[PDB]
Amino acid sequence: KPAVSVLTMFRYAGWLDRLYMLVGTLAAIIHGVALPLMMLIFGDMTDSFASVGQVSKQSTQMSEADKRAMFAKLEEEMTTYAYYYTGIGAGVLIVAYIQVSFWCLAAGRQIHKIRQKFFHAIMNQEIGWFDVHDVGELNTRLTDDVSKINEGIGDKIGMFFQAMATFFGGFIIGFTRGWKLTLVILAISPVLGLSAGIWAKILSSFTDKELHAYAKAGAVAEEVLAAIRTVIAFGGQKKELERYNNNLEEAKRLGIKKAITANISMGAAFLLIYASYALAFWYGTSLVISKEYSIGQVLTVFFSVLIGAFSVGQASPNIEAFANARGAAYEVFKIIDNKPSIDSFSKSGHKPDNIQGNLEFKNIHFSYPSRKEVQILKGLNLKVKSGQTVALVGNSGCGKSTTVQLMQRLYDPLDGMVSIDGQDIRTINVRYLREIIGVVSQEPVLFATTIAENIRYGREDVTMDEIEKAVKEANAYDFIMKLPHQFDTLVGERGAQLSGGQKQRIAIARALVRNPKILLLDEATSALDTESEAVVQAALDKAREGRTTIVIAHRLSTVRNADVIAGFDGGVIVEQGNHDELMREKGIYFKLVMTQTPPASFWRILKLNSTEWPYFVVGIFCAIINGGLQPAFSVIFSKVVGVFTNGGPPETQRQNSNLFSLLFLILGIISFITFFLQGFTFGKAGEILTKRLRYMVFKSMLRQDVSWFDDPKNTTGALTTRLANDAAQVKGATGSRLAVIFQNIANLGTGIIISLIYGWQLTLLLLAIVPIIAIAGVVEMKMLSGQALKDKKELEGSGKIATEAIENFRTVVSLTREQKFETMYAQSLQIPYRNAMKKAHVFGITFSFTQAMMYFSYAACFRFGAYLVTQQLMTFENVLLVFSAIVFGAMAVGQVSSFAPDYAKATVSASHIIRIIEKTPEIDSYSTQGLKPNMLEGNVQFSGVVFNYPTRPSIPVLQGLSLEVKKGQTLALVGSSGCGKSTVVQLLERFYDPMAGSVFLDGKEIKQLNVQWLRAQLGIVSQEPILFDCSIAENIAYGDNSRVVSYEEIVRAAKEANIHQFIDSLPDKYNTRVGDKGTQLSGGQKQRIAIARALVRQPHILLLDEATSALDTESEKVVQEALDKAREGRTCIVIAHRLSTIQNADLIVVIQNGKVKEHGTHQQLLAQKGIYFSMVSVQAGA
């Protein structure tokens, strides 16, 4: 919404840039003008043949006489026009190059200046300006915005003025050569713009509908694939598939409806286009019979106006390009034009010498630009004498840090003054101030360069001698020497990750080269290991003694030797003096002292598609007839112009034009039928395989085992995404592109034969030209992408050192040396700049070549078509025929190159979708194998089990685990911590088989048992029960599948689970919708419902996994009450964390590091002492 004045935007264009734009925009206008002049000549040529065509047929008496005057006229005429054509080709060749080159030259030169100035501005902004602004957004704003500006001031403008020139140029020639047809053409203009208007309305509306449609099906999948371990446990995999099939069923019906309407629209649009196109010509013919116009003129005015009309459509996108560019240039220039109060690039202000380092802070009130929300410094008084060292102490706010912040004049104080020596800090030059102040910070930063270089960021002028003494006086010398490469080592975020205490010591070495008179040390010792702290501490102490120093830390070991200690409370200075005095004050200080002591052949996807043997043949057969249909229009138009051109005695003509204009319209309406057909057939074909695929994919996805689902690569979102993209992407490839590609090959193949058989060697020649300009047209786009990529790589490297410069910024300003970063940036950019010059040279040649080739190619059409071919009997009427036939056959092949990528993107998206079906599990619920025992009663035998999780085969959870629990009794399970407790419940459900060892239920091995039937007997109840959206009765009825449960059954279950209080209370009762689409309710109820699911199944085995985990107060009591009523009739394993409620259990078993450590009844473990007595002691006491 905010934008920029048109003249500001060019502020960096002067002299040449200005001139370049003018010569370019000039050349561009000439270029544009060229094309309608070309079409103007086309009417003159028509007239020349037309005269002879009228006289040739007027003879029917003499022959040899016509071999003279006719040929002579054509000779002088044709040679003239051809000469002019060649004349226009050289023109467009020159102006095209001028056009693109100059405008790109302007672009390059300005953007270079935009770029430099911008970064310079960024580095100049005061720190408060950063504190309010997102650095991330700013740098991404840098690279992305300047590119938009580039797109805006580029050759896009040249293209705009070219388009206007064609628009004006066309309409002028249209109007002058006649007023009538132009206004008749202007009359049909609003109709073609309206139909395209119906398109923007249909597309925008229906695009959301399909997205809205699958959003429903994809909502089924998302709650399922998130809830998977629940559907696997309860084996509802046939149900969730059925639901997904139902939603897919609806989505395809909506899809075919959309396919019907969308094809009707496109078909009707093409009718109106061909209708008006034919209508305009009919009025055109009606004016020729009246002898108002030349038949040749009609072609000139008709082509010129329509060309000039479409020029508006082709112009519009460049307006947008310019428009967007201004908007982008607003926020960039805003920073550039902004001027700071503090500068730091300004040469002004006193530069005192023999600074004695006498500091004072007078009555300073300050607030960081969180501003009025908080005031952290209320007044202040502090003096620090020359050569002394003062230590600041505080509980919170770190208002101490503020003074170190103000002392570098990062911020000017609200009221009061900071005074270095006698003078105010605001009188002295900022750069020099920062230079006479050294700084060492809690978190040290190293830029990526040699250690010599990071030490060279203290001062640009330095020698390895000064480096050496610096690190040595920082006692960083010995430790780095041991490091390989010596001072030439590397450092940064990337590579050479080092001890902090060493980094801090390089930082102290850097600050030391600065040889400052004032030293600020903030917490530098803090947040560091105790051993290396003393090492660095030695350095810090050796860094002072030449300098006055203010230091802040939480280490009171480093304070004692300070000549002055100063505490703050609420921004108010309170205590000052020597340590003993402060201890005698027994104040805040004493308080703190005491406190601290890919492409391949995948046919089979098409084989899957072969379920429709028909519908393809219909669409194909239909499209090939539409292929043969398309050039018929080119054949008519040839003979409409042709017979009228070829007419001879006129009396017959006017009747014929009517017949043609009629037939001209007939291919129009027959096209509606054929286009709607092929589109609808493929469309339905697309939606049905969209079902089969998403079905077979989802289905195969339910098959896989928890091993696959625990994977990091596959998370619920990634699967839904994988599920949508692949199905959609194969559809396009089996879809329209194939319909269209076949339409086109038939289009050209029909066009070629007609052209071939009519012209001998007419056509043969043309076919030599077009593929060459087509390939020449493809290779340009290839170079274009190449240069684009290379430029991206070069500015990526410059933008990288930019990001470095502004991400660490608050440090670089503290050291100054922003000019170093200005210069580094400059040199970085100088390569794309030289690259950007070459770019213009190339863009101009390729463009001009492609245009000149098309214009020169045209000359050959008539030169060889006349002369050598028309000297012979072979005739004009067909020359016009072939012209359209081949050229529009080629323009149709152009769609091949356009639809190339959709195939790849579909094949890659296919490459995944074939594999995802054929991947097979270790454990598949689908196999009907397994024993299906007849005997009810469950035991559970765990013997010598070892388990390591497939995702994390590092720390094993289970090592030699052995448990036994008899039927109809409760096995309590205790543990130090972890899934050791819970993994039991997972293995019995057989989400995994163990590495070694085995587990038995009735004494049979589950490993050889039926996976489905096994789970069918289990009473699983987790921490946070997921309930699908549906009737709460349907959530309960999930406890049993392959059968529908009775109302009185799910009643008995709810009665059992004590959830019935709610369920009679609600308006809907059992049909209430839950899952926080229909309704929301707390955990206590959700759990009780899960309890109902569980004992709806009537399991012989209940598994209660940390059931009361998330819960509170009475809810725990009533849920526990329900769980307790749920067991004692059944085998169960309860891993719950309430050991007060485990006190009644048949067998309690302490698990330790995978091995059962203790086991027994409660009092039995109570009699002993060990882990379990401790477990029960701590929490009952806490």
Numbering used by the authors: 30 to 626, 689 to 1273
Question: How does the study describe this entry?
Answer:
Prior to determining P-gp–ligand co-crystal structures, an improved structure of apo mouse P-gp/Mdr1a was determined to 3.4 Å resolution. In previous structures of apo mouse P-gp, and also for ligands pertaining to subset B, TM4 adopts a mostly straight-helical conformation characterized by weaker electron density, indicative of regional flexibility.
The transporter P-glycoprotein (P-gp; ABCB1; EC 3.6.3.44) is expressed in the intestines, liver, kidney and blood–brain barrier, and affects the bioavailability, pharmacokinetics and efficacy of drugs. P-gp belongs to a superfamily of ATP-binding cassette (ABC) transporters found throughout all kingdoms of life. The transporter consists of two pseudosymmetric halves encoded into a single polypeptide. Each half is formed by six transmembrane helices (TMs) and one cytosolic nucleotide-binding domain (NBD) along with interconnecting loops and short helices.
